[PDB]
Amino acid sequence: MYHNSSQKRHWTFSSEEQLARLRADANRKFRCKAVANGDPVFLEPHEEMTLCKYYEKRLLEFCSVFKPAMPRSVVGTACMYFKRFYLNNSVMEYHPRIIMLTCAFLACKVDEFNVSSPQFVGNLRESPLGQEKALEQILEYELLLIQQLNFHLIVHNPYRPFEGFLIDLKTRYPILENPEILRKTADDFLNRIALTDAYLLYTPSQIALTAILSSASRAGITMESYLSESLMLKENRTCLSQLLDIMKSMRNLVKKYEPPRSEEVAVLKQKLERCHSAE
Amino acid sequence: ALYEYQPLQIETYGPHVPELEMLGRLGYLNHVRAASPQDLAGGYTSSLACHRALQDAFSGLFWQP
Amino acid sequence: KRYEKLDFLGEGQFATVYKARIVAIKKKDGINRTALREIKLLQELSHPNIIGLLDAFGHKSNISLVFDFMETDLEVIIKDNSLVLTPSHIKAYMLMTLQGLEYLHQHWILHRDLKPNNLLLDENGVLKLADFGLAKSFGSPNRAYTHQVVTRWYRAPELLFGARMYGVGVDMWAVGCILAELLLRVPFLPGDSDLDQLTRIFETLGTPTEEQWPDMCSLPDYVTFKSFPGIPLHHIFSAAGDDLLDLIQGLFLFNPCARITATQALKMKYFSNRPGPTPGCQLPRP
Numbered sequence: 001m002y003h004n005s006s007q008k009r010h011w012t013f014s015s016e017e018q019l020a021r022l023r024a025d026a027n028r029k030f031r032c033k034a035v036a037n038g039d040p041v042f043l044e045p046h047e048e049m050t051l052c053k054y055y056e057k058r059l060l061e062f063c064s065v066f067k068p069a070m071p072r073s074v075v076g077t078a079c080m081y082f083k084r085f086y087l088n089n090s091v092m093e094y095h096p097r098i099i100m101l102t103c104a105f106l107a108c109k110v111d112e113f114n115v116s117s118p119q120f121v122g123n124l125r126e127s128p129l130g131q132e133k134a135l136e137q138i139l140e141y142e143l144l145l146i147q148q149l150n151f152h153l154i155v156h157n158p159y160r161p162f163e164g165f166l167i168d169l170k171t172r173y174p175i176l177e178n179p180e181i182l183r184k185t186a187d188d189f190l191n192r193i194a195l196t197d198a199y200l201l202y203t204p205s206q207i208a209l210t211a212i213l214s215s216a217s218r219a220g221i222t223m224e225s226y227l228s229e230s231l232m233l234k235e236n237r238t239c240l241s242q243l244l245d246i247m248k249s250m251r252n253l254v255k256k257y258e259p260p261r262s263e264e265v266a267v268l269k270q271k272l273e274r275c276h277s278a279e
Numbered sequence: 280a281l282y283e284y285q286p287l288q289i290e291t292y293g294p295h296v297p298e299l300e301m302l303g304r305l306g307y308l309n310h311v312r313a314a315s316p317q318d319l320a321g322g323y324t325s326s327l328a329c330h331r332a333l334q335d336a337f338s339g340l341f342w343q344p
Numbered sequence: 345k346r347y348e349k350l351d352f353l354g355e356g357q358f359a360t361v362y363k364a365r366i367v368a369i370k371k372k373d374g375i376n377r378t379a380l381r382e383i384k385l386l387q388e389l390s391h392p393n394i395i396g397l398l399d400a401f402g403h404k405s406n407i408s409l410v411f412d413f414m415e416t417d418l419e420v421i422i423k424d425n426s427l428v429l430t431p432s433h434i435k436a437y438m439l440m441t442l443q444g445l446e447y448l449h450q451h452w453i454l455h456r457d458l459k460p461n462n463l464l465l466d467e468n469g470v471l472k473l474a475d476f477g478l479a480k481s482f483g484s485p486n487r488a489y490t491h492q493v494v495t496r497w498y499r500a501p502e503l504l505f506g507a508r509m510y511g512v513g514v515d516m517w518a519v520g521c522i523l524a525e526l527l528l529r530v531p532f533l534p535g536d537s538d539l540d541q542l543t544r545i546f547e548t549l550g551t552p553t554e555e556q557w558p559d560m561c562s563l564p565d566y567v568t569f570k571s572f573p574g575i576p577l578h579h580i581f582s583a584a585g586d587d588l589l590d591l592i593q594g595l596f597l598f599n600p601c602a603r604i605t606a607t608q609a610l611k612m613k614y615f616s617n618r619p620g621p622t623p624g625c626q627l628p629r630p
């Protein structure tokens with residue numbers, strides 16, 4: 001359960017500034033180690049973030065076309081693994097292309113989506129020799145990824161809380177005649193939420209509720225009473241205000257997210273290949 | 280020196296979830312898929328799925344890092 | 345790593361356990377799925393009656409888990425003959441097992457491997473559920489669970505009939521079998537095959553009817569059995585008092601839905617009656 005999970009205890013952070021501090025610290029540690037081993041080669045943390053966003057998008061593409069069809073919870077767990085790993089590691093020390101595959105591998109294992117290693121690597125759009133090489137890389141990096149996650153493998157996704165909120169709305173909010181028409185748009189919003197840092201800053205229930213209410217606002221339906229009356233927030237107005245602020249900041253997170261640009265992506269990829277060749 | 284039962288008091292940081300046996304009486308179960316006869320024979324009921332979904336919907340909703 | 349090996353404790357098919365300087369270390373597919381299951385489940389649980397995972401390590405696909413060292417286990421207690429199992433000791437063991445199971449079920453996890461050797465005891469008399477290598481999360485409709493879980497002697501009849509979807513009833517039936525073993529000091533239903541296990545169940549407790557188990561015939565491996573009267577429980581357990589018989593009957597109900605949950609068992613009068621459970625310090629040491 002999330003309310004006493006390791007995700008809440010160690011992997012939900014107070015602010016985006018703390019995440020930026022962790023990423024900058026990772027970048028600075030790699031720079032220190034590379035200089036103490038013996039220049040425009042190094043990537044700056046914002047470039048690292050651009051590459052990480054691009055490779056999270058590739059991870060989503062990989063998990064989408066994965067046969068047998070990957071469960072959505074496995075994809076969420078893999079994306080969370082990627083985010084957590086690159087919170088404390090640099091793309092220069094560990095290549096995101098291998099780390100995303102390792103994240104998907106570990107997520108399939110943890111979420112009990114039994115897929116054999118040959119049929120896991122068979123999903124890669126590469127010749128067999130590349131598939132074996134990638135399998136060896138994934139096996140090498142599996143324990144590293146697990147250690148960098150601090151052996152915290154259970155990831156609480158917003159999908160089950162989303163379903164629970166839909167059940168609660170169907171049962172106790174007759175004003176919302178058919179809550180199901182909120183799902184599609186809400187699902188869309190959830191996807192955008194996945195592209196930001198929101199999964200590291202907000203609870204899954206908060207993310208699901210924000211997606212639902214953003215869908216409702218986009219549909220023109222207002223559901224203040226559901227929060228105040230059904231969810232028991234008229235007795236404690238301060239808690240309702242905090243929830244509203246959480247949701248507004250989450251919407252602002254989605255608003256100010258910037259997708260990576262293709263030319264910057266290509267330049268940064270070539271720079272990262274340079275880093276991994278020189279290293 | 281005897282034993283007196285005390286319910287597991289764990290903070291959910293969210294709205295109170297109705298008890299499992301009350302889900303049918305309160306109308307929640309009309310919005311979850313009915314359990315098949317094999318499910319019931321094995322001991323699995325739609326009340327369990329509804330209860331888990333509601334518990335995860337309400338867990339940590341009021342929590343600030 | 346930090347740990348230097350000191351003694352060899354035990355060995356299973358998935359892993360081998362050795363005591364190290366004081367902790368216990370348990371040793372192309374990659375990291376073993378059983379070890380990952382144990383790690384991912386024990387990292388999300390913190391209860392006094394659930395074993396704690398201190399650390400893990402390894403190289404490449406190899407991995408070793410580190411737990412706090414447990415002095416004994418319920419199997420050694422039951423099989424020991426110099427030890428007397430008073431109703432107070434039995435009640436204490438059941439209480440700790442049921443408290444751990446109630447916490448575990450509250451977090452929607454089935455142990456599915458409950459047996460006397462998987463109930464570990466420390467020097468302070470605290471019982472802990474261990475061996476979460478088969479434990480799984482229940483409550484999700486879109487999650488097919490195999491029925492090979494639970495060792496045959498403790499496997500619930502719904503499992504033996506091929507139940508793919510089940511709930512806490514499997515753990516509670518295992519708990520009832522453990523209680524019967526504590527009372528009799530021998531395994532309750534020592535079947536040598538699935539059919540033999542079902543035969544022993546239906547002969548000791550009577551073949552369940554369509555009224556005791558409404559959808560019994562809908563299970564995948566359901567086989568019609570001849571009708572046994574079943575031995576009355578007070579003859580099997582002559583020393584047990586009426587409250588204990590009530591608890592045992594609740595634990596051994598054939599309908600898994602009607603079978604008593606861990607919370608319901610904890611609320612039963614058997615645990616609140618006197619004598620109370622013995623303190624962990626006064627529990628028998630083999």
Ligand SMILES: CC(C)c1cnn2c(NCc3ccccc3Br)cc(N[C@@H](CO)[C@H](O)CO)nc12
Pocket residue numbers: 353354355356361368369370395411412413414415416417420461462464474475
């Ligand atoms: C691994 C960890 C959970 C642990 C810690 N302690 N411990 C004990 N101690 C009891 C004992 C002590 C000294 C001499 C003999 C025994 Br018996 C047994 C055990 N049993 C293992 C295999 O050995 C079962 O396969 C599954 O639990 N696991 C553990």
